[PDB]
Structures are given as structure tokens and as C-alpha cells.
């Protein structure tokens, strides 16, 4: 019966760590490295047209920056994404597929397919157990894409030049550039890879996921299963502010939900 609303606008941030590729050395005379690196994920989102009484719209944008650097540098990724879905059940009309940013009303202790967009496909997303979120009971969920449940690298994603985002889905450099292995001079042409790791904290009652904890990694590779130049590799978890905004929003849906429900019956 409920709905998503349509004055969704929210900016979330979630910090973490991650290994990545310096984009200043694009042109240097080694591909630079920088590990350990204090890095802040961004998703700030908002609801556009098409949105009616049947679906809403959600604009996405994605930003990982370092936060060992001023506003104006250690810029890592930035991705948007936008998809249409059925207000009722939060299921997708790039075609998205399954859920996206928010579980259904009245979420089951049970599975649900759920998309990655760089993968393009929906994976599952496995009940893993009850836990409590800032007072409120939520139910977490796990996903893998491209890690098989016992958390090996096994079917990763090979980026298309189509959908390659803001690096090369193919690069060729010298041995010496990538540094790696190679004969004097050695020409080495390497395809990028994606593989994630994600849990999901929803409140059952509204949908929201109010915490989310991610494992994006992403690796240039002569074969898939063996890795050889990081491009980005970050964990993140959703910040303790983001984490009370979102456990208020919830909050304030179920207590409309429950005046809506309370109405229609007596």
C-alpha cells in the first residue's frame, strides 16, 4: 500500500580506505600507486521526472574522493546513474533490473535481486541476520558481484570501451610504465575488471537503507583471475551522520505509514 515519496533528495557520505591509481600520473614516466589512502564516498540523490502516482525517478550521482587533499584534488571516481521504479515495490521499470537504492515495504527475512550498474545485471542480496542500527531493528543483507559466497575472485566483470566510465576499459604501456615483469621495452596490454562487495542495513518496515558498507575494486589484468595493476580498490561504510539521517528519515516514513494504516482501519 505505501509508497516512495517524491521529495527524496539525500546526500550520503560513507569513509573508508582504498588502494588507487594517482590520476596525475597518467602521463608520469611510472604508473603511480598511492595505498592506504583516507578516501570519502559521496551519494547524493534526488527524485526527477518521469515521477507519478505509479513510479519515481531517482538521479544518482557517485563521487570517491581523498580526504587527505583539498576540494579540488585526489578527484577518484565519479559515476551517475539513473533509474525509473514502481513506487509500491521498488522494482526497476541504461534497463536497471530488480531493486536499487531502497528495499520494498514490509522487506522479508529472504533474498532479493539486487543491481549492480557497472555489472549491469541484478545479484542477489542474501538475509544475513538482524541487527540494531542507532535503537532501530534492521535486517542486513549481502551481496557479491563477481565473488563467489566464500569470497573468492571468480567471475569478474570485464568493462566494454562502451561502458569503460573514466578509464580505459584497454590500456597499452610498456612493461616499465605498468610496473611490471617484461622483456626491455615490452608492450603489455592489460583490460580493466570490476568485482564488489556489499551489506545492506534496511529498516523492514520502510525500505530504507539506512547503512551500507561497500568493497569496489577495479584492476587492469592480462587475465581476469589474476589481477596485476590496481585502479581502484576501496572499502567504505556509511558515516555515523549519514547513518542518523537515515534512521530519521525511516523513522519519519514508518510514522506516516502507521497514520495512513491507522486511518484505514479504526
Known sequence: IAKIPLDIDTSLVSDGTATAFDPDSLVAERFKIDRDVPVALQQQMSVEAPSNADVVTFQVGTTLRRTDRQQDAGLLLALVDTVTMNRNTAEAVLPHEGLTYRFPFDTEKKTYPFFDPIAQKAFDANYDGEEDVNGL???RFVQN???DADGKLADPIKYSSLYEDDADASVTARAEVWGVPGEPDES???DRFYAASRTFWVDPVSG??????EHGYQYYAREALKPEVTYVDFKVTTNEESVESQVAAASD???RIALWTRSRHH
Open 137 to 139: 531493528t534492521t535486517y
Open 145 to 147: 558481484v563477481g565473488y
Open 188 to 190: 603489455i596490454t592489460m
Open 208 to 213: 530504507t537503507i539506512v547503512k551500507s558498507e
Open 253 to 255: 516514513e514508518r510514522d
